[PDB]
């Protein structure tokens, strides 16, 4: 997502050539030394074995010519806070003394209370009299990175789950609809107009031709310019990169305006996920231990759905025996499977390929090789000749179906500068509209990740008194012990922002909103709101707003002052005996989909030197039955299974084919033999001149 782009930049990495390795990493280099405040975010770091070695710059940080991370502060003089922003490095941060931005400035630069929170040189925190303060912070949320500043109600979340939230806010996938978050910070707009994935009107003008591919802007003084989109362009991780315009043919634009949304954007505000209705009951054990259930509405109406564009590539490299020709005809390939291939050998744009289809048909010279008597007989009887030239056509990998968005053919005849030996390199871009599925990983903005345990139908879903079904159902037990009640506040505010409130100020603005800005005394349904990070919605504000929502269509305040509602069980029918929390939470679709993870092997490729099965989903490979699992099955006493998994599934070269033959013929699985890692060893020891021999007696 665009944010992952803008955050892979601005990244500080201490594990580089000229730095330290992940083994020479002194454990004193990963802690947040108190000089990091305003120069490096203490929250956002990868949670793997890299914690603290990789971080990200602060929002306001700026790098000194010499390379020291400066930071803006406000100069307070004679107890007068000014607006002359002055930048300071860590040394002058230690010399001088720094106040806080959430301090009572009395509209004149003047502090109010003499005892002021302040930071001393060694990270100490002290109540200085308000005369020795010479610098004050430029704003709150100065300590924090870009991605973490987009988490509403961050100050309520624990640092662990906020860290997780920041590290998963960069893993959302671009959906096909891209809905803006109902509740957010100020950093959804400034994180898109500066991430580069949103076309920007360079100079003011009026649009003339707005089409799905090109916008023509008529810059006032004569000149015109055509901005061009990148519809359905493959990203570096297989995701879509569409750019659709948002302007009409008569609109006037100003310089610096958003003119076309990107992959994850809506009206210019970073939008990584959808605003889904959420209830917080534990339901039937399907949302057990972080699991999440969904309505079938999310699948059907295509609410959560990510387009994945995969690239396949085959080169027509030269060979000694001859030249590999990308041609339709292939030795044994029948016309039935051949149907897709057009003439050159490539598929036609649009053919729905499935695991095993011939995307590109390439035939490689093989020369004359002996034909087994039996094969010769069959070939003659059925009237099929040899055509020695062997088949090595590209085939769509297992579980990579979809349409063929586009085919790109590079050839030496066209003077394309392919690497030496490659007469032709063709790349086929297949693509699929993956929908939400059991095992897909969904997460909010607060670290509350979880797989989809079950997509229930729409009727067996707890619906409100209005008949509106809830869309997801999180679990309760995950909230209190993870210390991330942000999601709860985000939930309540979310509902407030959906139904819209009307501050009952008929008798004057209640104290609950005495400090709330103007034009918040009333709000409209589906009205967008924002809470900055460390100056957000004081809990009292949420209580009062939650108790001051306007009814939907009838006279019906569905969510009472406590924030809960009377849900009806969609399955049984009886109302739940206790009111339940409901609201609108903004949740994302992470890039840990099942289709990228499910894997299986019965018999596939084999390694070269040792004869073990290969490794990884790119090949088939098996799962490493490692040392600890060997201990586990030694502890059970399972000897025969251990012998199996270490002889006639991995290495017993003559034993594997016998096992397969005996399975097909329906016979007892053969007795296993010596592996091929106790014979390479034997020949090595008889090669280092150590006579290792086996004598039964």
């Amino acid at each position: 997502n665009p944010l992952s782009g803008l955050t892979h930049k601005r990244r500080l990495s201490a594990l580089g050539p000229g730095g330290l390795s992940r083994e020479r990493a002194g454990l004193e280099v990963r802690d947040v030394h108190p000089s990091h405040y305003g120069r490096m975010c203490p929250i956002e770091t990868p949670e793997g074995p890299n914690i603290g070695l990789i971080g990200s710059l602060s929002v306001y940080a700026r790098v000194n010519p010499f390379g020291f991370i400066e930071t803006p502060y406000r100069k307070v003089v004679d107890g007068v806070v000014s607006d002359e922003i002055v930048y300071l490095t860590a040394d002058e941060e230690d010399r001088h003394v720094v106040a806080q931005a959430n301090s009572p400035i009395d509209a004149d630069g003047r502090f109010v209370e003499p005892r002021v929170l302040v930071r001393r040189k060694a990270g100490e925190v002290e109540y200085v009299p308000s005369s020795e303060v010479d610098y004050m912070d430029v704003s709150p949320r100065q300590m924090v990175s870009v991605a973490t500043a987009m988490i509403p109600f961050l100050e309520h979340d624990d640092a662990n789950r906020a860290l997780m939230g920041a590290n998963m806010q960069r893993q959302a996938v671009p959906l096909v609809r891209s809905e803006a978050p109902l509740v957010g910070t100020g950093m959804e707009l400034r994180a898109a107009i500066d991430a580069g994935d949103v076309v920007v009107a360079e100079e003011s003008g009026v649009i003339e031709e707005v089409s799905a591919d090109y916008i023509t802007v008529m810059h006032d003084n004569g000149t015109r310019r055509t901005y061009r989109m990148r519809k359905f362009a493959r990203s570096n991780h297989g995701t879509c990169a569409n750019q659709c315009p948002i302007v009409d043919a008569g609109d006037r634009v100003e310089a610096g305006q958003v003119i076309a949304d990107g992959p994850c954007t809506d009206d210019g505000e970073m939008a990584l996920g959808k605003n889904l209705l959420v209830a917080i009951m534990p339901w039937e054990g399907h949302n057990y231990e972080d699991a999440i259930i969904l309505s079938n509405r999310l699948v059907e109406e295509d609410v959560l759905t990510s387009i994945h564009i995969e690239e396949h590539e085959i080169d027509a490299r030269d060979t000694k025996l001859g030249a590999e020709e990308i041609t339709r005809d292939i030795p044994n390939i029948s016309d039935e499977v051949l149907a897709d291939l057009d003439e050159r050998g490539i598929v036609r744009i649009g053919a729905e390929v499935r695991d095993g289809d011939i995307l590109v048909g390439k035939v490689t010279p093989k020369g004359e090789t002996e034909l087994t008597p039996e094969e010769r007989l069959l070939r003659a009887i059925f009237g099929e000749k040899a055509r020695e030239v062997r088949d090595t056509s590209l085939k769509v990998p297992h579980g990579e179906s979809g349409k063929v968005i586009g085919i790109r053919v590079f050839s030496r005849e066209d003077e394309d500068e392919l690497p030496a030996g490659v007469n032709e390199l063709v790349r086929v871009y297949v693509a699929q509209k993956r929908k939400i599925s059991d095992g897909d990983k969904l997460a909010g903005r607060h670290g509350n990740k979880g797989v989809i345990g079950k997509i229930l139908p729409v009727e067996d879903m707890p619906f409100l008194a209005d008949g509106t079904p809830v869309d997801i159902i999180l679990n309760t037990h995950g909230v209190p012990r993870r210390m991330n009640i942000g999601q709860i506040l985000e939930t309540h505010l979310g509902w407030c922002a959906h139904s819209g409130w009307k501050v009952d100020a008929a008798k004057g603005v209640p104290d609950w909103a005495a400090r709330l800005p103007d034009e918040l005394l009333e709000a409209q349904p589906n009205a967008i709101v924002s809470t900055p990070v460390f100056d957000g919605a004081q809990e009292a504000e949420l209580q009062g707003l939650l108790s001051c929502t306007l009814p939907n269509r009838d006279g019906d305040v569905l969510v009472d002052a406590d924030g809960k509602a009377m849900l009806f069980d969609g399955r049984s029918g009886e109302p739940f005996p206790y009111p339940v929390t409901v609201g609108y939470m903004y949740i994302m679709k992470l890039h840990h989909l099942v289709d990228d993870k499910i894997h299986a092997r019965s018999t596939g490729p084999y390694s070269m030197i040792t004869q073990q099965p290969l490794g990884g989903k790119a090949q088939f490979g098996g799962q490493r039955f490692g040392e600890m699992e060997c201990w586990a099955m030694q502890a059970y006493g399972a000897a025969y299974t251990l012998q199996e998994l270490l002889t006639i599934k991995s290495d017993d070269t003559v034993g594997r084919v016998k096992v397969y033959e005996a399975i097909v013929k329906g016979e007892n699985i053969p007795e296993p033999g010596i592996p091929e890692s106790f014979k390479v060893l034997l020949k090595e020891l008889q090669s280092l001149c150590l006579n290792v021999e086996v004598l039964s007696s």
Partner: peptide
Amino acid sequence: NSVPGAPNRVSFAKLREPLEVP
């Protein structure tokens, strides 16, 4: 705010941040 076509997103900021995001 300060971006021509800005989604009118009402903020709860009690404070007033002087410096713009760089």
